[PDB]
């Protein structure tokens, strides 16, 4: 979904997390469309930093650490999914 403008609200359209205010441009599958979403919270699913710039599950709010898969398969298939956790 085209976006092409900066500092987007949640629910707005995004090609990439750099545009979102949240700095998470999420979308539920590979074929769905990327809309800004909110950083996951403690204890909710997350992904570690993707280069693809677009998430199936967001990065966590500050102070938290996404604790789950950080494998190779994951990094290419954009599925390094972890739960957020304190330290």
């Amino acid at each position: 979904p085209r976006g092409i403008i900066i500092n987007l609200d949640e629910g707005e359209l995004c090609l990439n997390s750099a545009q979102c205010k949240s700095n998470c441009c999420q979308h539920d599958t590979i074929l769905s469309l990327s809309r800004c979403a909110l950083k996951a919270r403690e204890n909710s699913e997350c992904s570690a930093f993707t280069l693809y710039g677009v998430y199936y599950k967001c990065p966590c709010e500050r102070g938290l650490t996404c604790e789950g898969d950080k494998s190779l398969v994951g990094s290419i298939t954009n599925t390094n999914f972890g739960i957020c956790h304190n330290v």
Binding site: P1, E10, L13, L38, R41, E42, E61, R62, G63, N86
Partner: protein, 448 residues
């Protein structure tokens, strides 16, 4: 002028039906054949595909209609038809929570004409829905008690017709953002108003004025309880760019409807969710909305907060007046349930500039990180705010604190001696630590 039609009696174009100044033009209702009021039945026994009733007792006695249940009518409004998914949602959600007769009310024939026209036919739509209650009551036995009629825009008024003609004996009428133009003003005998049923609870999601900011909603009170979620005038989730509003996640019909009358339409949105979140819509008496956002009137009064939407009917202080207004904040998307908590933090460490930020943990679950203050952080100042958590944490066990956006190489440290959280319940929970932490670090406080 006057027309009279078979079942529905006569229809004068006399004041205050027209001529009066907020309703100038003299125009009549249409034949009860053009309106073409239809009654689309849905039950637990038959979500997904509707039955169809006319007032004919045999029809409703040979149908999935059940008079050992309870009945809810859903009347659309202008430019809409009783099939449109929003009317079915409300039946679906209702079926999750409840066993019920969920009659959607189509009058798409009547509704697609001119605005003034459409606002005129509603007397017929009112009179149809009114007549149906009649035959239920007298022919079938089904007391106008058990009826609850919900209507949106023009439809709320229709429900006011049905309510009026029924000598105000229907249990409840719900006004999902009543239509302002030629109804706001206009005597009790044109608009919805608390007289039209035993309890009339209105949700105002697009008040503030047709001129010049284009609101189709009613400033005016009406009904007993009068909720103005998000302050009534500007629903959050409706200022999106054109592209994002139209291509919205429920398909490109919904986004166009929200492109056209977003704020206006949110009324049945909020109603729909509240069916499923019985506690997510608590409303707050206040002398204003600004005074509410100015954090000057929390938690809920000793009697309770009304729940906005499906559960306003269980408020105790309910019929006990007229035009009681209440404020709550709602989500921006399609779970809209929020839960207001007040949190005050007292700071340790030393003078730093930045934001504080707290997150609640409780036996139910835990919350996002809501800001609380931002500025010169510095020790011993107590700071406060209340925020609309999108998680109901329940009974608190802990909280955490976190701050950001001023560190020299110094690596300053800031902390919280005590944070007390007050639920809308009224409870205050106390949380203490003598720790400090450096920025972007999560200090948990425990109950002192």
């Amino acid at each position: 002028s006057e027309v009279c039609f078979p079942r529905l009696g006569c229809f004068s174009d006399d004041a205050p039906w027209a001529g009066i100044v907020q309703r100038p033009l003299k125009i009549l209702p249409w034949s009860p054949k053009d309106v073409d009021t239809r009654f689309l039945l849905y039950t637990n026994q038959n979500q997904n595909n509707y039955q169809e009733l006319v007032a004919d007792p045999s029809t409703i006695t040979n149908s999935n209609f059940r008079m050992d249940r309870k009945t809810r009518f859903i009347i659309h409004g202008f430019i809409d038809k009783g099939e449109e998914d929003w009317l079915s949602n409300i039946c679906k959600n209702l079926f999750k929570v409840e066993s019920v007769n969920c009659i959607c009310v189509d009058w798409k024939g009547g509704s697609r004409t001119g605005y003034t026209q459409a606002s005129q036919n509603i007397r017929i739509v009112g009179a149809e829905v009114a007549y149906f209650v009649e035959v239920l009551k007298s022919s079938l036995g089904y007391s106008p008690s058990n009826v609850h009629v919900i209507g949106h825009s023009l439809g709320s008024h229709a429900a006011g017709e049905a309510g009026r003609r029924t000598n105000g004996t229907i249990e409840r009428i719900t006004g999902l953002d009543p239509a302002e133009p030629c109804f706001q003003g206009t005597p009790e005998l044109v608009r919805l108003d608390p007289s039209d049923a035993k309890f009339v609870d209105v949700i105002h999601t697009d008040a503030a004025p047709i001129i010049p900011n284009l609101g189709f909603g009613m400033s005016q009170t009406v009904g007993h309880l009068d909720f103005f979620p998000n302050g009534g005038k500007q629903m959050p989730g409706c200022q999106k760019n054109i592209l994002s509003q139209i291509v919205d996640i429920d398909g490109i019909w919904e986004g166009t409807r929200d492109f056209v009358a977003c704020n206006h339409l949110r009324s049945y949105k909020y109603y729909a969710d509240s069916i499923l979140n019985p506690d997510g819509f608590a409303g707050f008496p206040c002398d204003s909305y600004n005074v509410f956002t100015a954090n000057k009137c929390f938690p809920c009064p000793s009697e309770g907060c009304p729940q906005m939407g499906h559960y306003a009917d269980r408020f105790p202080g309910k019929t006990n007046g007229v035009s009681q207004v209440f404020y709550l904040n709602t989500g921006d998307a399609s779970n809209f349930a929020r839960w207001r908590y007040k949190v005050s933090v007292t700071l340790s460490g030393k003078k730093v500039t930045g934001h504080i930020l707290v997150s609640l943990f409780g036996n139910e679950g835990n919350s996002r990180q809501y800001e609380i203050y931002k500025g010169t952080l510095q020790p011993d100042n107590t700071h406060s705010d209340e925020f609309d958590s999108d998680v109901e944490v329940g009974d608190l066990q802990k909280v955490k604190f976190i701050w950001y956006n001023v560190i020299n190489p110094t690596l300053p440290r800031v902390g919280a001696s005590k944070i007390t959280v007050e639920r809308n319940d009224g409870k205050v929970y106390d949380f203490c630590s003598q720790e400090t932490v450096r920025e972007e670090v999560l200090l948990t406080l425990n109950p002192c």
